[PDB]
Amino acid sequence: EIQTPDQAEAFVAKVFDVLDSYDYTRFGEVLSTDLKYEGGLQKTSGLDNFINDIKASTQRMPGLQTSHSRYRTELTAEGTIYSEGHSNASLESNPGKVVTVPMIGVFKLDSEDGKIKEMRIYKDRLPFLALH
Amino acid sequence: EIQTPDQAEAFVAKVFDVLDSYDYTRFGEVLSTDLKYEGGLQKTSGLDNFINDIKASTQRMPGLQTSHSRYRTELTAEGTIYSEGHSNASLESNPGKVVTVPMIGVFKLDSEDGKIKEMRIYKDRLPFLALH
């Protein structure tokens, strides 16, 4: 059970250590099998579909590396987590070219096992064209 | 003074009625003179600079018209408002072509006059190229 913002931040940090590793075999450790994901106009239902969409992104941006920071994490009485911070990206073929944008993540947790059942990520995708 | 989420939602609705009207002479009714704005990589300081950036947007997309809906509005104990919903845009010359993206707004209020002193807007801008 996540009850404090510090516990929420610790969980989101754990989530993004898995996500930014792109070790898809571990995504199910923190993401529900029935995950509802929204990222702009991109939407997926189910953990497998989310994984396939991420794999497609890594082929659009070959050598993609990502990392994340957060400066404010809120926990609502409904249990939803709002996390405000930044999203970094670069290509392995040119690691000195880093694109960083503000990002907000909204996370709804499963009451049974604490996994993320809904994840909505808000960031401007336009700056990442600079990686090409 | 805003103390309930219902009051926060009522305020944000009034704010976007002003913003989507593009009546810059009234922006100061709800926005602080020292407004700190961030929308992706776009950042401005001061109400006049925010207004000038919006005018530039309306010249990039001649006939730009916008509207907004919200389905969740939260009020933190710090006073900050988080609002999740959608942002719609079209051109007056082709009103049937509507682009709609998810959006979250984060609003910090001035304790003196209740105006927005910091506004952070998160949406993917890439879909709006389809207006051209």
Short mmCIF file of C-alpha atoms in Angstrom, two decimals:
data_model
loop_
_atom_site.label_atom_id
_atom_site.label_comp_id
_atom_site.label_asym_id
_atom_site.label_seq_id
_atom_site.Cartn_x
_atom_site.Cartn_y
_atom_site.Cartn_z
CA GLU A 1 0.00 0.00 0.00
CA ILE A 2 1.18 3.45 -1.07
CA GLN A 3 -0.02 6.02 1.46
CA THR A 4 2.49 8.90 1.39
CA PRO A 5 3.98 10.96 -1.46
CA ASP A 6 7.42 9.61 -0.52
CA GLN A 7 6.11 6.07 -1.02
CA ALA A 8 4.57 7.15 -4.32
CA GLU A 9 7.88 8.65 -5.51
CA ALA A 10 9.76 5.50 -4.46
CA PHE A 11 7.31 3.40 -6.49
CA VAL A 12 7.46 5.62 -9.59
CA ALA A 13 11.27 5.48 -9.38
CA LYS A 14 11.07 1.68 -9.31
CA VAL A 15 8.67 1.74 -12.27
CA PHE A 16 10.92 3.89 -14.41
CA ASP A 17 14.03 1.87 -13.56
CA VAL A 18 12.19 -1.03 -15.21
CA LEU A 19 10.75 0.98 -18.11
CA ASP A 20 13.99 2.75 -19.05
CA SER A 21 15.79 -0.61 -18.98
CA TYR A 22 13.57 -1.85 -21.85
CA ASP A 23 13.75 -5.32 -20.25
CA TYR A 24 10.25 -6.23 -21.38
CA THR A 25 10.35 -9.49 -19.39
CA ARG A 26 10.16 -7.34 -16.23
CA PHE A 27 7.43 -4.92 -17.32
CA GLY A 28 4.82 -7.21 -15.72
CA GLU A 29 6.46 -6.64 -12.33
CA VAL A 30 4.96 -3.14 -12.15
CA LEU A 31 2.37 -3.01 -14.96
CA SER A 32 -1.00 -4.75 -14.91
CA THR A 33 -1.73 -7.32 -17.61
CA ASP A 34 -4.79 -5.23 -18.54
CA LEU A 35 -2.87 -1.93 -18.61
CA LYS A 36 -4.68 1.06 -20.12
CA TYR A 37 -1.99 3.35 -21.56
CA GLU A 38 -2.35 6.80 -23.15
CA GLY A 39 0.49 8.84 -24.56
CA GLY A 40 -0.96 11.65 -26.63
CA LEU A 41 -2.93 10.11 -29.46
CA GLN A 42 -1.21 6.75 -28.86
CA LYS A 43 -3.39 4.36 -26.84
CA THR A 44 -2.98 0.68 -26.01
CA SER A 45 -4.99 -1.89 -24.06
CA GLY A 46 -3.17 -4.80 -22.46
CA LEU A 47 0.42 -5.21 -21.34
CA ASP A 48 1.46 -7.05 -24.50
CA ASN A 49 0.17 -4.26 -26.74
CA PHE A 50 1.99 -1.63 -24.67
CA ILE A 51 5.25 -3.60 -25.00
CA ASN A 52 4.81 -3.91 -28.77
CA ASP A 53 4.26 -0.15 -29.08
CA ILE A 54 7.45 0.56 -27.10
CA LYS A 55 9.41 -1.89 -29.26
CA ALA A 56 8.13 -0.01 -32.31
CA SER A 57 9.40 3.25 -30.81
CA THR A 58 12.86 1.73 -30.30
CA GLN A 59 12.92 0.78 -33.99
CA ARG A 60 11.82 4.27 -35.06
CA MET A 61 14.68 5.67 -32.93
CA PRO A 62 17.42 3.01 -33.17
CA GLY A 63 19.72 3.06 -30.16
CA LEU A 64 17.14 4.90 -28.06
CA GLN A 65 18.19 5.54 -24.46
CA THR A 66 15.91 7.26 -21.94
CA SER A 67 16.00 8.45 -18.34
CA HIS A 68 13.69 10.41 -16.08
CA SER A 69 13.68 12.81 -13.14
CA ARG A 70 10.85 14.08 -10.96
CA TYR A 71 10.54 17.12 -8.75
CA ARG A 72 6.94 16.82 -7.50
CA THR A 73 4.84 13.72 -6.81
CA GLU A 74 1.26 13.93 -5.53
CA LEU A 75 -1.02 11.19 -4.22
CA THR A 76 -4.77 11.75 -4.36
CA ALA A 77 -7.29 10.40 -1.87
CA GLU A 78 -8.59 8.28 -4.76
CA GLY A 79 -5.11 6.71 -4.90
CA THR A 80 -4.06 8.23 -8.23
CA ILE A 81 -0.45 9.43 -8.51
CA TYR A 82 0.51 12.62 -10.35
CA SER A 83 4.22 12.93 -11.03
CA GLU A 84 5.80 16.03 -12.57
CA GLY A 85 9.36 16.07 -13.89
CA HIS A 86 11.41 15.63 -17.06
CA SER A 87 12.00 12.99 -19.74
CA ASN A 88 15.46 12.64 -21.33
CA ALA A 89 16.34 10.84 -24.55
CA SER A 90 19.38 10.28 -26.72
CA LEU A 91 20.63 7.83 -29.33
CA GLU A 92 23.50 5.46 -28.54
CA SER A 93 25.14 6.49 -31.84
CA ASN A 94 25.37 10.13 -30.63
CA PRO A 95 25.12 10.18 -26.82
CA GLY A 96 26.02 13.87 -26.53
CA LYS A 97 22.75 14.95 -28.19
CA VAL A 98 20.27 14.84 -25.31
CA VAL A 99 16.65 15.94 -25.72
CA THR A 100 14.86 16.80 -22.47
CA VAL A 101 11.20 17.81 -22.17
CA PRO A 102 8.85 18.42 -19.23
CA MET A 103 6.67 15.43 -18.47
CA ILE A 104 3.68 14.57 -16.30
CA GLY A 105 2.72 10.99 -15.49
CA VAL A 106 -0.66 9.93 -14.13
CA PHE A 107 -0.82 6.46 -12.56
CA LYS A 108 -3.86 4.56 -11.33
CA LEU A 109 -2.98 1.54 -9.19
CA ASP A 110 -4.68 -1.82 -8.89
CA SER A 111 -6.06 -2.11 -5.36
CA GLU A 112 -5.29 -5.85 -5.26
CA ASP A 113 -1.56 -6.00 -6.08
CA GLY A 114 -0.41 -2.38 -6.41
CA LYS A 115 0.46 -2.62 -10.11
CA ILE A 116 -0.21 0.23 -12.51
CA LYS A 117 -3.57 -0.40 -14.18
CA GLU A 118 -3.82 2.99 -15.93
CA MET A 119 -0.86 5.08 -17.11
CA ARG A 120 -1.24 8.41 -18.90
CA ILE A 121 1.96 10.17 -19.99
CA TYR A 122 1.96 13.80 -21.12
CA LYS A 123 4.92 15.29 -23.00
CA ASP A 124 5.48 17.18 -26.25
CA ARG A 125 6.81 14.70 -28.79
CA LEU A 126 7.85 17.39 -31.29
CA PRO A 127 11.28 18.08 -29.66
CA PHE A 128 12.35 14.45 -30.07
CA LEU A 129 12.53 14.89 -33.84
CA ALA A 130 15.83 16.65 -33.06
CA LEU A 131 17.32 13.21 -32.39
CA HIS A 132 17.25 12.56 -36.16
CA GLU B 1 -10.75 32.02 -2.33
CA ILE B 2 -10.69 28.45 -3.70
CA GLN B 3 -11.06 25.76 -1.01
CA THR B 4 -13.00 22.94 -2.72
CA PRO B 5 -12.35 21.01 -5.95
CA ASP B 6 -15.71 22.30 -7.20
CA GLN B 7 -14.43 25.87 -6.81
CA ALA B 8 -11.17 24.93 -8.55
CA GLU B 9 -13.05 23.48 -11.54
CA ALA B 10 -15.29 26.55 -11.67
CA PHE B 11 -12.20 28.78 -11.74
CA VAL B 12 -10.40 26.79 -14.45
CA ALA B 13 -13.52 26.93 -16.61
CA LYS B 14 -13.62 30.71 -16.24
CA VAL B 15 -9.89 30.86 -17.08
CA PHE B 16 -10.22 28.90 -20.29
CA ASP B 17 -13.27 30.87 -21.39
CA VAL B 18 -10.95 33.90 -21.28
CA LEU B 19 -7.98 32.11 -22.86
CA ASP B 20 -9.95 30.52 -25.69
CA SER B 21 -11.54 33.90 -26.42
CA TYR B 22 -8.08 35.35 -27.27
CA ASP B 23 -9.29 38.60 -25.69
CA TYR B 24 -5.83 39.58 -24.50
CA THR B 25 -7.23 42.71 -22.83
CA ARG B 26 -8.91 40.39 -20.29
CA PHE B 27 -6.04 37.93 -19.74
CA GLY B 28 -4.95 39.96 -16.72
CA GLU B 29 -8.29 39.25 -15.04
CA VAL B 30 -7.17 35.68 -14.32
CA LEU B 31 -3.41 35.71 -15.02
CA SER B 32 -0.74 37.35 -12.88
CA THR B 33 1.42 40.14 -14.28
CA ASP B 34 4.44 38.02 -13.29
CA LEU B 35 3.06 34.83 -14.86
CA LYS B 36 5.53 31.95 -15.25
CA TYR B 37 4.33 29.83 -18.19
CA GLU B 38 5.71 26.54 -19.48
CA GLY B 39 4.32 24.57 -22.41
CA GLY B 40 6.83 21.95 -23.46
CA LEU B 41 10.05 23.72 -24.43
CA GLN B 42 8.16 27.03 -24.70
CA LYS B 43 8.68 29.18 -21.60
CA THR B 44 7.73 32.79 -20.88
CA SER B 45 8.01 35.14 -17.92
CA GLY B 46 5.52 37.96 -17.49
CA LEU B 47 1.97 38.39 -18.75
CA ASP B 48 2.99 40.47 -21.78
CA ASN B 49 5.46 37.82 -22.96
CA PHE B 50 2.82 35.09 -22.60
CA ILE B 51 0.39 37.20 -24.64
CA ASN B 52 2.98 37.85 -27.35
CA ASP B 53 3.74 34.12 -27.68
CA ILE B 54 0.04 33.31 -28.10
CA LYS B 55 -0.31 36.01 -30.77
CA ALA B 56 2.62 34.37 -32.58
CA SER B 57 0.76 31.05 -32.46
CA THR B 58 -2.34 32.62 -34.01
CA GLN B 59 -0.18 33.96 -36.85
CA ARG B 60 1.41 30.56 -37.48
CA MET B 61 -2.12 29.07 -37.71
CA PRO B 62 -4.29 31.83 -39.20
CA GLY B 63 -7.86 31.48 -38.00
CA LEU B 64 -6.89 29.35 -35.00
CA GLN B 65 -9.83 28.55 -32.72
CA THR B 66 -9.57 26.45 -29.57
CA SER B 67 -11.74 24.90 -26.87
CA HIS B 68 -11.22 22.65 -23.87
CA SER B 69 -12.94 20.01 -21.78
CA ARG B 70 -11.96 18.54 -18.43
CA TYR B 71 -12.93 15.32 -16.70
CA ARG B 72 -10.83 15.53 -13.52
CA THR B 73 -9.79 18.56 -11.46
CA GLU B 74 -7.73 18.19 -8.28
CA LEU B 75 -6.82 20.70 -5.58
CA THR B 76 -3.73 20.06 -3.47
CA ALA B 77 -3.20 21.23 0.10
CA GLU B 78 -0.47 23.51 -1.27
CA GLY B 79 -3.19 25.18 -3.38
CA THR B 80 -1.94 23.91 -6.75
CA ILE B 81 -4.62 22.79 -9.24
CA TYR B 82 -4.18 19.78 -11.55
CA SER B 83 -6.68 19.47 -14.41
CA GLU B 84 -6.90 16.54 -16.84
CA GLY B 85 -8.91 16.73 -20.06
CA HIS B 86 -8.63 17.51 -23.78
CA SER B 87 -7.58 20.41 -26.01
CA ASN B 88 -9.37 21.01 -29.33
CA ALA B 89 -8.21 23.17 -32.24
CA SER B 90 -9.40 24.00 -35.76
CA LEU B 91 -8.98 26.73 -38.36
CA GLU B 92 -11.81 29.14 -39.17
CA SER B 93 -11.17 28.45 -42.87
CA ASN B 94 -11.89 24.72 -42.38
CA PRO B 95 -13.86 24.27 -39.14
CA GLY B 96 -14.69 20.63 -39.88
CA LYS B 97 -11.05 19.57 -39.39
CA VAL B 98 -10.72 19.33 -35.59
CA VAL B 99 -7.56 18.14 -33.84
CA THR B 100 -8.08 16.96 -30.25
CA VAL B 101 -5.30 15.83 -27.89
CA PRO B 102 -5.19 14.90 -24.20
CA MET B 103 -4.05 17.74 -21.97
CA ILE B 104 -3.13 18.34 -18.35
CA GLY B 105 -2.87 21.81 -16.82
CA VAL B 106 -1.06 22.68 -13.59
CA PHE B 107 -1.96 26.02 -12.00
CA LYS B 108 -0.41 27.81 -9.02
CA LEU B 109 -2.45 30.71 -7.66
CA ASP B 110 -1.33 34.05 -6.26
CA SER B 111 -2.42 34.28 -2.63
CA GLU B 112 -3.09 38.03 -2.93
CA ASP B 113 -5.60 38.19 -5.80
CA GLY B 114 -6.32 34.56 -6.77
CA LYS B 115 -4.78 34.97 -10.22
CA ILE B 116 -2.69 32.24 -11.82
CA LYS B 117 0.97 32.96 -11.12
CA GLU B 118 2.39 29.75 -12.65
CA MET B 119 0.78 27.73 -15.44
CA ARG B 120 2.25 24.53 -16.89
CA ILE B 121 0.44 22.95 -19.84
CA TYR B 122 1.24 19.44 -21.06
CA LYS B 123 0.03 18.24 -24.49
CA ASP B 124 1.57 16.63 -27.58
CA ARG B 125 1.96 19.40 -30.15
CA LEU B 126 2.83 17.05 -33.03
CA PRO B 127 -0.82 16.28 -33.99
CA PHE B 128 -1.52 19.98 -34.60
CA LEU B 129 0.69 19.97 -37.70
CA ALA B 130 -2.34 18.29 -39.33
CA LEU B 131 -4.09 21.68 -39.27
CA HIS B 132 -1.72 22.74 -42.07
#
